[PDB]
Design a protein around this ligand. Structure first.
Ligand SMILES: [Ca+2]
Ligand SMILES: [Ca+2]
Ligand SMILES: [Ca+2]
Ligand SMILES: [Ca+2]
Ligand SMILES: [Ca+2]
Ligand SMILES: [Ca+2]
Ligand SMILES: [Ca+2]
Ligand SMILES: [Ca+2]
Ligand SMILES: [Ca+2]
Length: 604
């Protein structure tokens, strides 16, 4: 296999106080050998005798609040350089204080405030530790079709120690809302440091205070929309937030009505992804449209410049059937076995070279999941739900590479949420299900194996994120309890024996994001072992709280950020209606040994 550019990562050693001792976990790196084992040191002294070789975690019954840990890789009996010293966290929470921006007033005299919203991660300085890239959302942010002015969108960078690095202000000409700004954080050129790409406009102010274009320009109409004036695409330096290059946004508006309405409702439907279109280095993919005209534009970033790679446009001859298929998210994976990434754009797919891969014709939906959902069947599968009541299926399971529909279930109505996850150890692969979102009819559309066997008419009442949280191979479920105004985050576990969800984590003082959608700020394997961390905002957005597991595992996996599908999932997590990340391999009961990551480290 081709070796993919990936991020340098430190051991990511953490230590957390529990009632039974100090829980320690660290990364198994893509550069480690399958036979690599580990020694642990507490207060300078080795506390392991036999190197730890079956996991990258440890419960130290002799650890105290004052203990300091280091880990060393061991290969062929030879021990390597010890990690940085890790101190013991008092709780399984790392709190990152925020510089909460002050609210304001829109032109119509209506006040707004800010809350901490979607995030992404990138290593902006190349030291092997992630920084947080955080989007602030004003309290007046808008669904496209709802009129009204919005507060300016702000994007911040923070170090995990709470250091505020910079703020980008997108300015008055970028409307706030789920479907507008899609911020892509990645080391696009391979120097070892992440940059940030997003759509910008006249009046966007970068991290060093430099304004893009005309500072005086105001393209907001009486309804608070921006439907005129230049549109730009900017790559910002990770370290400083400074604009590196700005180009014209593609595709341009053209005649408004050609998108299907004159209000920009369909036109201003943006998505973004990072994809290894050559199977070796990342490319940037900025997308516009899914209900009607659908356009994906690929770029390569090198030596301070964006260069257009290709354009997929449903208006192109032979591509008409590709319109109306995109979801409020996209997925990225090598689905056809050529080593190169394809874009799974909801109910259709675009090949690595920008040609049409397939269109299912099943139409736009609000959730999708690409992974090895049926490990008995060669290749990846796509499970998704569908919104159009007139279409054949409310939920569909297909071959990811050919688009062949393996099975589907008719609904004759919008199926607004869906999940695919290994929640039942007695089925090798994912169960899949569809349910109504909160504040709707509370309907279930069934729980099925990925082969289409109906387990029950009543599906798990959570269909949002799935998260590896505890020690076992089953995936847990992340959602919230929505009360009509706010959501209280939770992680739940499926009880397959009696067909119910049990709450296993529900932290106080934090809120979910994006209304009924109930998103975390971010879910990602940020540090420690292969289990995933989760970030939620405090109620007042004075801080982010990053939660990490303290459940001991007997299982060992390479860090998920070194997985070619999972890492790209983190990059698109913020995109429109946030979707959860998946592994390129089947992780679950009865799994075969995963292949070691085929990679090289950017920046040597
Ligand atoms: Ca860093
Ligand atoms: Ca870079
Ligand atoms: Ca491929
Ligand atoms: Ca291909
Ligand atoms: Ca939708
Ligand atoms: Ca499969
Ligand atoms: Ca589990
Ligand atoms: Ca972890
Ligand atoms: Ca989002």
């Amino acid at each position: 296999p081709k070796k993919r550019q990936m991020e340098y990562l430190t051991r990511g050693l953490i230590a957390v106080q529990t009632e039974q001792g100090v829980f320690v976990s660290w990364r198994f790196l893509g550069t480690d050998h399958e036979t690599t084992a580990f020694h642990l040191y507490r207060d300078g002294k080795r506390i392991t005798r036999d190197p730890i070789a079956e996991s990258t975690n440890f419960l130290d019954q002799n650890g105290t609040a004052d203990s300091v840990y280091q880990v060393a890789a061991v290969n062929k009996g030879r021990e390597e350089k010890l990690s940085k010293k890790a101190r013991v966290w008092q709780e399984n929470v790392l709190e990152v204080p925020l510089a909460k921006p002050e609210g304001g007033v829109t032109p119509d005299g209506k006040p707004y405030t800010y809350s901490a919203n979607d995030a992404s991660v990138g290593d902006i300085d190349g030291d092997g530790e992630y920084e947080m890239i955080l989007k602030w959302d004003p309290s007046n942010s808008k669904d496209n079709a709802h009129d009204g002015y919005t507060g300016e969108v702000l994007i911040d960078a923070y170090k995990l120690d709470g250091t505020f690095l910079w703020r980008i202000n997108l300015g008055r000409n970028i409307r706030a809302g789920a479907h507008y700004t899609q911020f892509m954080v990645y080391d696009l050129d391979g120097d070892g440091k992440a940059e940030i790409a997003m759509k910008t406009a006249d009046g966007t102010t970068d991290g060093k205070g430099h304004i893009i274009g005309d500072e005086q320009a105001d393209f907001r109409n009486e309804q608070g929309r921006i439907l005129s004036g230049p549109e730009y695409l900017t790559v910002f330096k990770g370290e400083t937030g400074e604009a590196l290059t700005t180009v014209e946004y593609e595709p341009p508006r053209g005649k408004l009505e050609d998108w299907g309405d004159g209000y920009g409702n369909r036109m201003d439907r943006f998505l973004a992804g990072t994809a290894y279109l050559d199977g070796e280095r990342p490319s940037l993919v900025m997308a516009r449209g899914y209900y009607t005209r659908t356009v994906l534009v690929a770029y390569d970033f090198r030596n301070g410049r964006l260069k257009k790679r290709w354009v997929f446009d449903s208006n192109q001859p032979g591509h008409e059937a590709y319109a109306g298929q995109g979801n409020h998210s996209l997925s990225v994976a090598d689905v056809d076995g050529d080593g190169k990434d394809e874009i799974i754009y909801g109910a259709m797919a675009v090949d690595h070279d920008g040609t049409g891969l397939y269109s299912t014709g099943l139409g736009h939906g609000d959730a999708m999941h690409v992974g090895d959902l049926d490990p008995s069947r060669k290749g990846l599968e796509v499970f998704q739900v569908h919104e159009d009541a007139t279409k054949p299926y409310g939920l569909s399971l297909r071959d990811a590479g050919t688009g062949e529909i393996l099975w589907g279930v008719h609904a004759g109505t919008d199926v607004g949420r869906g999940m695919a996850a290994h929640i039942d150890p007695s089925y090798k692969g994912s169960l899949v299900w569809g349910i109504d979102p909160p504040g709707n009819d509370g309907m279930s559309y069934g729980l099925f194996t990925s082969k289409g066997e109906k387990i029950s008419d009543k599906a798990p009442s959570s269909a949002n994120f799935a998260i590896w949280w505890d020690g076992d191979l089953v995936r847990e479920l992340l959602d919230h309890d929505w009360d009509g105004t706010i959501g209280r985050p939770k992680i739940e576990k499926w009880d397959a024996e009696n067909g119910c969800l049990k709450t296993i984590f529900q932290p106080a003082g934090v809120l979910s994001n994006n209304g009924t959608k109930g998103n975390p700020v971010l879910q990602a394997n940020l540090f420690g072992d292969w289990r995933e961390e989760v970030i939620w905002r405090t109620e007042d957005s004075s801080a982010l709280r990053i939660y990490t597991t303290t459940h001991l595992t007997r299982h060992c996996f390479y860090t998920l950020m070194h997985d070619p599908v999972y890492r790209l999932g983190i990059a698109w997590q913020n995109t429109a209606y946030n979707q959860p990340p998946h592994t390129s391999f089947y992780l679950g009961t009865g799994m075969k040994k995963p292949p070691k990551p085929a990679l090289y480290i950017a920046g040597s």
